[PDB]
């Protein structure tokens, strides 16, 4: 019944059994350990020098080993392909699908009965969970946790968030280029990932909300001894999960994805969460669209008072009660599917029914929330088939300026300024010839999965310095790229199809009038449908949208099969491989 | 001039520089270390629990770190995707190209000025060297080394080789199925890779002969303290190589490949060496064909008395003088390109001019060799466009039986028995209905890069047990797969194109007369050219050669671009990416 | 000039040089590394499973190694004998002198040119510094740092301090015996030592004030990446200190001890600091008495607002500016000997001249201090030749009750209740027959270096529960033992000579009137000098003071040479060994 026995204890094939035993005993494992029906537990290790965010997982694996051994298993630790958001060029999103490919190969083709997935930095959570979904042997995820709180002259400084606030304090002469480095260094005072509500905190929280972590695990800061005890408890549990055959497909049900969509809104989750969870849904065989994110999550209020939306940081999120406290608030409104089973063998409802808010400054009750209507809205129209807007970081300046007109409520119109990539933007934003005022919507195209190739976090553009000196902070930002989860920009992201894939962004000229109507969920460049096909005819004639040639073999290989962000930016030909450890391997 | 400064010390982009610094300082590296022009040295780490052969590299990296620090560099250790020959299913050759892809992405897209490649198990050497070739920043390779000698009742037992000798001592009732495990376990008495002249010993020796290791490094057994001192010396040297900009393209010249072809013959190298070095040649932009292997290497004699061809093991190879002693014997005949520069900054001729044979039982002089004419012969004909034959392991039983006829010298004819994969063979070999005698040539088809998908080491087939009980040991083996380097079978391997790619093997019927003529280098099934196209017409009509559907996304992705073993079984669309760290990234 | 060459590079003795080289090369060190005049740097490692407080030093040593290698040295890491305050029975003070003995043997008898001392838990700081003082090769100390702040329902909880507050919240029915464990576990949320102003924080701060750490090093919490960068900087510096021959005797001058006495008062240092620094003074050959502590430190105000005296914890102490900020406040009053050289090669005055208070809630200015007159007073009389009183934790309840009488200001009298050890006290304190009221001074005898043997932290006795239920919290505590540095008890400690050494405590009967006069610095049992010798005659006649027989060989060996706490509780025959690396070895 244990698939590892086909390698280490196969009486029908004496020759090959002796071959695997010989190699896997050369650092002291005994024949009896490998031939006594003990679960072989992989640790999918994401920590290294090259991934500082996840590096503490090298130490946490020691506690995992204690739990596995004690429970009767054997650990085989092995590496996941490196991903690092602050490091990989041109973009670390290029590499989520590559790490997925390799991890599928290890889980499928080696004698592993179960796996501990070490998650942390932005894309390691989906890469690990996607591969676990495809192979579908029992799997449990362990967050490494955020860095400790940053401290600067008595105030909390958040990683990532302090950058966008210092990039406006530097571009206004109020901060030099040397003290800019000190204010940023203060925000990374320990090991762990981003300590704001960035993509990493989002995805690790959602991994718990999905049922893939022990309750309370996601929020624990990396240097806390609580993280080390949880690592041990997961080592014990994954062995029992093997005996129970508790698989990702048993846990990652539609109602688990619904719980995660609603927790995402309540915690202020990143605009990257729909990309990664739609990816995961497809790889486990559950249907989940961008429209589901609006349907289940748009009207959920924001409860977690964390930067960039709020004031506090990861340590405070943990002390306040973390994911269980958030789930418990949603349970009080009947907005949690409480019977969804989780890795610890209990339902999310049983795990969270007694979770209280332990700090009311950091986590708000549902009825007195931090902000209402904090989910995602999907915008459609001639600009793109889908894009989403981060409603949780709309400020009162943005609300009072743009969303306050009696002629057209919850809607605005303005002039469009288009940049073709982040380099084009960084060379034209401060250019006074552009005449960027209070009625301008900046566009960023060519930054999607195929165009960049990435996709890259380049949409949260800053206003020109002649507008930031007058007092205009945030401006409408729309693009076919992404943004950092730590961004407090209420941008219109993830436009699908991208420009390089025939999206309407490809034919937008700077100076065209555009109308973003959040009420009717539309996003159109105000032009003729006749002139629309004329711009597209001239495009196909002069060769399609222009974007850089591939620079590596993987760039080229991935560009030929990758789909759009709307559906997870997955390798499209990989999705047919379902439950491959048990369906012999699938089409 | 150091490419790492674009990440850690880029005054034009203050924002992003602060971002990389923040993350890479969170385990204690100082700003000064990262912003003082110090070479950033990657360690491409191949050791893990999942790769027992290479696992000691986790410990060797400590000595590498000492050398890099002392020389003024900074180490960033990161993982290579796991490959393990005794472990990966269905074949570890499926994963050489996947590890290549990921390592290209790390070297190209991270702030690395140079890299230490940790090599060992069969495919880690080419995977690491291929990726280093594509990116072409300074790189040095470190072998982990073989396991210690096996000992069984006073005799040396070799890993891999003891299996083929116990698989014939078990299939003849002279060894049970429990004592079979003990005789094999004795051959793996420490950490390290195979201690015979297998693929790992071959490829690690060739890496030194190519100029990519310090002289004397390849042969050192893994547990020897000499291995730890060499690791430190390489850490020092890679930093100097960065200052000198000594690149793989400077070292991997045509004449380096010629030196390796000739060292391969002298050491008894594996039939997998042409696949991996033709791959490496293409990835560095040097021309190298299977015909070059015959042209430069066929007539070189066998000098190393190691199992499977000979008697001794890896420790003895090291004590006898290792690669330098072999090179020095070839230098005495003027058969080494002595001016080829190597990683230590000296030519291979200067490194080896004083290397002596220290044990004459283990390494023979050129003039009194162990065997003559020990290289590869290329066979062509209607069976395949190319295949090679391992001349160094032809026994006197094989020579006296097959290669001793006055009607046709150095040639034989016989009946063909075809198996479609290793499973078909293991179900028909002992079948008495086959009537396999002294005039039978067994064929193995469907085992190539696309068919298996692998390719897999399945050609060294054993004779039926009714022939092994009479006294017939080795039989002619021909196929479109590979064999283990530890095999003493003089097989005809690496047939290109494979059956699944339209090779002549696809239309061979069991019972057809075949003629292998080593004199004229031909290999034909004795049939009509008219009937040849008829069998092929019926094939294309009934759908092509049959082989398993892909089981994973990577299997499918790789099958669409992988080429044939004749030209390295590389990803064909990857070869256009040349010197991509300096040519901006290449087409 | 490097003493390590007598081992590794001694041309006069070829035989023995080859012997040491052979052994120390067996894990890969080269002959050239050991025979090229490179400083051999020991790391005196105090971390282990058995010493949780110091265990992170096992990880910090990696950064130390980077700095030593980079600077041109070689690291030899070796262990210090385990000491652990929360762990060793019957007392961890028994083992400070044993760790000292062993570390002297390593530094003196091995080829070490310099040493990094890893300090942390209470007694590792003096044990390491004492041994470094005796041998006197260049030495630098590295604190591991405190644990992170404890958090319980929105409030800071300190390790050790939360115990004394929960031992009074448990002994009053307001806390059960299970929730008692949770409130204490919250105070230890990471690796590191006690996060209050306990003995560890005291001694590590004083090690910096003495000049034995890089400026700013003492206060850094253990999990902060700042700790890892400082570890690296010390590895670099110790190599330069070897070239400069900057020795403990150059740094630990009388004026360094004066700086530490005054910093001790300003930070609220533990009553154990005089024991350990008088020990260190004697081992380096500087004169320092308990009277010096009063003379130089009594009138210094308390500036650090840390538990137990104040509100904050170790992280806040670091953010506020740590030791340099405290030194800078004392410099502003001319109370620092600013020209005392420190390990980094600069004077303490140059290192601290620009150190500012960064959080005014945590560190107070000298002129608006937290409390005045916060040092130690020495009490003498017929009870003991010396004892000290912790003036920084005298509460207003203690001040208003006891130190507020017009008949005798700053003085009190009361009834004496004597317990013979902690076991006797724990069996009699709550006994209602004792009738303990507002005019009772509790005594603890038999707890000194010889009696316990310890000495043990047993003097901070709690009031009976019938007094704690009425409202009487703190009572006068006097004894020949110690107390925890985390104690907010204004006790009279360290009585010398102890009862078991003939101190006046040995003849004190319960019920005797005693008069503690802090004004005249006297402490007498109000009895006749005639009756005093009568009680002592009856003692010597009936055999001396009673105390347990030795339980281990070390207990017995130490009892025969150990002196009293007044003079450091050192091995008295060890003090004559001065500068033994250079004076051939001393008498
Ligand atoms: Cl690993
Ligand atoms: Cl905090
Ligand atoms: Cl619902
Ligand atoms: Cl690694
Ligand atoms: Cl041997
Ligand atoms: Cl030649
Ligand atoms: Cl140690
Ligand atoms: Cl003074
Ligand atoms: Zn990250
Ligand atoms: Zn191997
Ligand atoms: Zn301690």
Q: Which is it for strands C522-525 and C513-517: parallel, antiparallel or unpaired?
A: antiparallel
Taking an 8 Å cut-off on Cβ atoms, the answer to whether C27 and B228 are in contact is: yes
Q: How far is CA C351 from the centre of its chain?
A: 24
Give the 3-state secondary structure of residue A424. Answer: helix
Binding positions of B for Zn(2+) are 53, 121-122
CA distances from B422 to A19, A177, B134, B502 (A): 16, 66, 34, 20
| B354 close contact with C: CB closer than 8 A | no
Best CA proximity match to B126, nearest among B206, B222, B47, B57? B206
CA distances from A390 to A266, A276, A393, A486, C277 (A): 12, 16, 6, 12, 60
Give the 3-state secondary structure of residue C503. Answer: coil
| B184 close contact with A: CB closer than 8 A | yes
Taking an 8 Å cut-off on Cβ atoms, the answer to whether C191 and A226 are in contact is: no
Give the 3-state secondary structure of residue C571. Answer: strand
Cβ-based neighbour number of residue C377 at 10 Å: 18
- Where helices occur in C457-577 by DSSP H, the ranges are 465-468, 529-541, 553-559
Residue A585: phi and psi, rounded to 5, are 145, -10
C-alpha span between C362 and C266 (Å, rounded) = 12
C-alpha span between C314 and C323 (Å, rounded) = 12
Backbone gaps in chain A, preceding residues (C–N over 2.5 A): none
Q: With the C-alpha atoms ordered B328, B331, B335, B339, is the resulting torsion angle positive or negative?
A: positive
Task: Output DSSP code: residue A549.
Answer: P
Q: What is the DSSP string of B557-575?
A: HHHTTB--GGGTS-BGGGT
Experimental method: X-ray
Give the 3-state secondary structure of residue A101. Answer: helix
Q: With the C-alpha atoms ordered B216, B221, B224, B225, is the resulting torsion angle positive or negative?
A: positive
Cβ-based neighbour number of residue B439 at 10 Å: 14
CA distances from C358 to B401, C288, C296, C306, C326 (A): 91, 33, 27, 15, 11
Q: Which residue from B minimizes the CA distance to C66? A: B69
| A557 close contact with B: CB closer than 8 A | yes
Task: Output DSSP code: residue C572.
Answer: G
Contacts of B147 (CB under 8 A, 6+ apart): A26, B159, B188, B189, B190, B191, B192, B193, B194, B195, B221, B222, B314
C-alpha span between C103 and C116 (Å, rounded) = 12
CA distances from A427 to A471, A583, B45, C473 (A): 22, 53, 40, 70
- For Cα atoms C166, C171, C174, give the angle at the middle one, nearest 5 degrees: 70
Best CA proximity match to A485, nearest among A324, A267, A189? A267
Give the 3-state secondary structure of residue C25. Answer: coil
A121 is in an annotated binding site: yes
| A37 close contact with B: CB closer than 8 A | no
Taking an 8 Å cut-off on Cβ atoms, the answer to whether A181 and B110 are in contact is: no
- 3-state SS track over A465-491: HHHHCCCCCCCCEEECCECCCCCCCCC
Residue A44: phi and psi, rounded to 5, are -80, 100
C-alpha span between C584 and B502 (Å, rounded) = 85
Provide the shortest C-alpha distance from residue A180 to chain B (in Å): 8
C-alpha span between A225 and C417 (Å, rounded) = 43
Q: Are C215 and C310 in contact (CB under 8 A)?
A: no
Cβ-based neighbour number of residue C560 at 10 Å: 11
Q: Which is it for strands A40-45 and A114-119: parallel, antiparallel or unpaired?
A: parallel
| B177 close contact with C: CB closer than 8 A | no
Classify residue C435 as exposed, middle or buried by CB count within 10 Å of its CB (0-12, 13-18, 19+): exposed
Q: With the C-alpha atoms ordered A215, A221, A225, A227, is the resulting torsion angle positive or negative?
A: positive
Q: What is the DSSP string of B416-480?
A: EEEEESHHHHHHHSS-GGG---TTEEEEEES-STTTSSS--B---PPPPHHHHTTT-----EEES
C-alpha span between B411 and B399 (Å, rounded) = 10
C-alpha span between C145 and B470 (Å, rounded) = 77
Q: Are A125 and A83 in contact (CB under 8 A)?
A: no
CA torsion, points C236, C238, C239, C242, in degrees to nearest 10? Answer: 160
Residue B515 pairs with which residues in a beta bridge? Answer: B413, B524
Q: How many helices (H) and strands (E) does chain A have?
A: 22, 14
C-alpha span between B492 and B481 (Å, rounded) = 9
Q: Which is it for strands C74-79 and C40-45: parallel, antiparallel or unpaired?
A: parallel
CA of B385 to the centre of ligand 6 (A): 27
Q: Which is it for strands C40-45 and C114-119: parallel, antiparallel or unpaired?
A: parallel
Q: Are A242 and A113 in contact (CB under 8 A)?
A: yes
C-alpha span between C195 and C187 (Å, rounded) = 8
Give resolution, Å, one decimal.
2.3
Binding positions of B are 53, 121-122
Longest dimension (CA), chain B: 81
Q: Are C319 and A151 in contact (CB under 8 A)?
A: yes
Provide the shortest C-alpha distance from residue A359 to chain C (in Å): 7
Residue C77 pairs with which residues in a beta bridge? Answer: C43
C-alpha span between B547 and B452 (Å, rounded) = 7
Neighbours of chain B (3+ CB pairs under 8 A): A, C
- 3-state SS track over C420-481: ECHHHHHHHCCCHHHCCCCCEEEEEECCCCCCCCCCCECCCCCCCHHHHCCCCCCCCEEECC
Taking an 8 Å cut-off on Cβ atoms, the answer to whether B28 and C72 are in contact is: no
Best CA proximity match to B428, nearest among B444, B447, B448? B444
Neighbours of chain C (3+ CB pairs under 8 A): A, B
For the sheet containing C440-445, what is the strand order?
C376-379, C386-390, C492-496, C477-479, C440-445, C411-420, C513-517, C522-525
C-alpha span between B39 and B76 (Å, rounded) = 10
Q: Which is it for strands A411-420 and B376-379: parallel, antiparallel or unpaired?
A: unpaired
Q: With the C-alpha atoms ordered C522, C524, C528, C532, is the resulting torsion angle positive or negative?
A: negative
C-alpha span between A54 and A51 (Å, rounded) = 6
Provide the shortest C-alpha distance from residue A68 to chain C (in Å): 20
CA of A283 to the centre of ligand 9 (A): 23
In this complex, which of B102, B181, B561 lies closest to A18 when CB atoms are compared? B181
CA of B212 to the centre of ligand 6 (A): 21
Task: Output DSSP code: residue B39.
Answer: P
CA of A340 to the centre of ligand 3 (A): 13
Q: Which residue from B minimizes the CA distance to A561? A: B557
C-alpha span between B73 and C140 (Å, rounded) = 25
| B90 close contact with A: CB closer than 8 A | yes
| Buried residues in A33-49 as b, exposed as e (16+ CB within 10 A) | ebeeebbbbbbbbbbbb
Chains B and C form CB pairs within 8 A to the count of: 44
Q: With the C-alpha atoms ordered C294, C295, C298, C301, is the resulting torsion angle positive or negative?
A: negative
Give the 3-state secondary structure of residue A116. Answer: strand
C-alpha span between B357 and B354 (Å, rounded) = 10
Chain A residues closer than 8 Å to B75 by CB: 49
Q: Are B280 and B567 in contact (CB under 8 A)?
A: no
For B387, half-sphere exposure in the C-beta direction (CA atoms, 13 angstrom radius) is 37
Cβ-based neighbour number of residue C182 at 10 Å: 11
Give the 3-state secondary structure of residue B364. Answer: coil
C-alpha span between A219 and A312 (Å, rounded) = 13
- Where helices occur in A120-178 by DSSP H, the ranges are 124-135, 161-170
Strand ranges (DSSP E) for C362-401?
Answer: 376-379, 386-390
Which residues of chain C from 215 to 274 reach within 8 Å of chain A, CB to CB? Answer: 223-226
Chains A and C form CB pairs within 8 A to the count of: 35
Give the 3-state secondary structure of residue C47. Answer: coil
| A75 close contact with B: CB closer than 8 A | yes
Q: Are B103 and B80 in contact (CB under 8 A)?
A: yes
C-alpha span between C227 and A421 (Å, rounded) = 40
Give the 3-state secondary structure of residue C8. Answer: helix
C-alpha span between A514 and A415 (Å, rounded) = 7
C-alpha span between A401 and A475 (Å, rounded) = 10
| C31 close contact with A: CB closer than 8 A | no
Best CA proximity match to A304, nearest among A252, A267, A337? A267
Chain A residues closer than 8 Å to C151 by CB: 319
Best CA proximity match to C130, nearest among C99, C156, C166? C99
| C319 close contact with A: CB closer than 8 A | yes
Taking an 8 Å cut-off on Cβ atoms, the answer to whether A7 and B50 are in contact is: no
Q: Are B272 and B199 in contact (CB under 8 A)?
A: yes
Provide the shortest C-alpha distance from residue B87 to chain A (in Å): 6
Best CA proximity match to B100, nearest among B560, B570, B579? B570
With residues binned 3-state (H G I as helix, E B as strand, rest as coil), the percentages for chain A, rounded to 5, are 40, 15, 45
Which residues of chain A from 288 to 317 reach within 8 Å of chain B, CB to CB? Answer: none
Q: Are B222 and B191 in contact (CB under 8 A)?
A: yes
Q: Are B209 and B259 in contact (CB under 8 A)?
A: yes
For the sheet containing A386-390, what is the strand order?
A376-379, A386-390, A492-496, A477-479, A440-445, A411-420, A513-517, A522-525
């Amino acid at each position: 019944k244990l698939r590892s026995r086909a390698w280490f204890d196969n009486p029908d094939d004496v020759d090959m059994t002796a071959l695997y035993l010989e190699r896997y005993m050369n650092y002291g494992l005994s024949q009896e350990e490998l031939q006594s029906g003990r679960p072989i537990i992989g640790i999918a290790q994401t920590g290294s020098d090259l991934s500082p965010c996840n590096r503490h997982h090298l130490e946490l694996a020691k506690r995992v080993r204690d739990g596995v051994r004690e429970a009767g298993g054997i650990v085989i630790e092995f590496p996941v392909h490196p991903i690092q958001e602050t490091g990989k060029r041109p973009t670390a999103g290029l590499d989520r699908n590559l790490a997925y490919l390799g991890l599928v190969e290890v889980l499928y083709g080696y004698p592993l009965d179960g796996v501990v997935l070490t998650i942390g930095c932005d894309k390691t959570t989906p890469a690990c969970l996607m591969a676990a979904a495809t192979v579908n042997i029992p799997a449990i995820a362990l967050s490494v946790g955020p860095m400790l709180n940053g401290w600067f002259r008595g105030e909390r400084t958040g990683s990532g968030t302090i950058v966008w606030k210092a990039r406006e304090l530097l571009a206004k002469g109020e901060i030099d280029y040397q003290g800019f480095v000190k204010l940023v260094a203060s925000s990374a005072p320990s090991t762990g990932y981003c300590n704001t509500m960035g993509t990493a905190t989002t995805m690790n929280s959602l991994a718990e909300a999905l049922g893939m972590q022990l309750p309370g695990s996601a929020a624990i800061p990396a240097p806390y001894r609580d993280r080390q005890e949880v690592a041990y408890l997961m080592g014990r549990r994954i062995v029992e999960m093997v005996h129970e055959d508790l698989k990702p497909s048993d846990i990652l049900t539609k109602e688990a994805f619904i719980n995660a969509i609603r927790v995402n809104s309540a915690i202020g989750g990143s605009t990257n969460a729909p990309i990664h969870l739609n990816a995961l849904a497809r790889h486990i065989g559950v249907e989940l669209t961008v429209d589901d994110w609006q349907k289940y999550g748009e009207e959920i209020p924001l409860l977690v008072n964390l930067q960039p939306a709020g004031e506090y940081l990861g340590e405070d999120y943990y002390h306040a009660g973390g994911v269980p406290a958030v789930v418990n608030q949603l349970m009080g409104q009947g907005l949690i599917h409480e019977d969804a089973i989780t890795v610890n063998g209990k339902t999310i409802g049983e795990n969270c029914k007694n979770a209280t808010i332990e700090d009311g400054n950091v986590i708000k009750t549902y009825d007195q929330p931090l902000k209402k209507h904090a989910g995602f809205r999907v915008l459609r129209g001639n600009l793109f088939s889908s894009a989403i807007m981060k409603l949780s970081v709309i400020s009162d300046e943005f609300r009072n300026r743009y969303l306050s007109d009696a002629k057209d409520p919850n809607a605005f119109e303005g002039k469009a300024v288009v940049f073709d990539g982040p380099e084009d933007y960084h060379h034209r934003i401060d250019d006074p010839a552009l005449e960027i005022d209070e009625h301008t919507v900046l566009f960023m195209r060519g930054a999607g999965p195929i165009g960049y190739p990435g996709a890259a976090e380049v949409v949260n553009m800053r206003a020109p310095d002649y507008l930031l000196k007058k007092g205009i902070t945030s401006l409408p930002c729309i693009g076919d790229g992404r943004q950092s989860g730590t961004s407090g920009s209420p941008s219109i992201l993830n436009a699908s199809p991208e420009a390089a894939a025939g999206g309407g962004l490809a034919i937008l000229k700077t100076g065209d009038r555009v109308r973003i109507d959040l009420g009717r969920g539309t996003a159109d460049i105000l032009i003729s449908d006749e002139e629309l096909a004329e711009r597209r005819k001239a495009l196909e004639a002069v060769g399609g949208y222009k974007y850089p040639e591939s620079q590596t073999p993987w760039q080229e290989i991935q560009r030929a099969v990758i789909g759009q962000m709307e559906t997870g930016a997955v390798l499209e030909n990989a999705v047919k491989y379902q439950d491959i450890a048990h369906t012999r391997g699938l089409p």
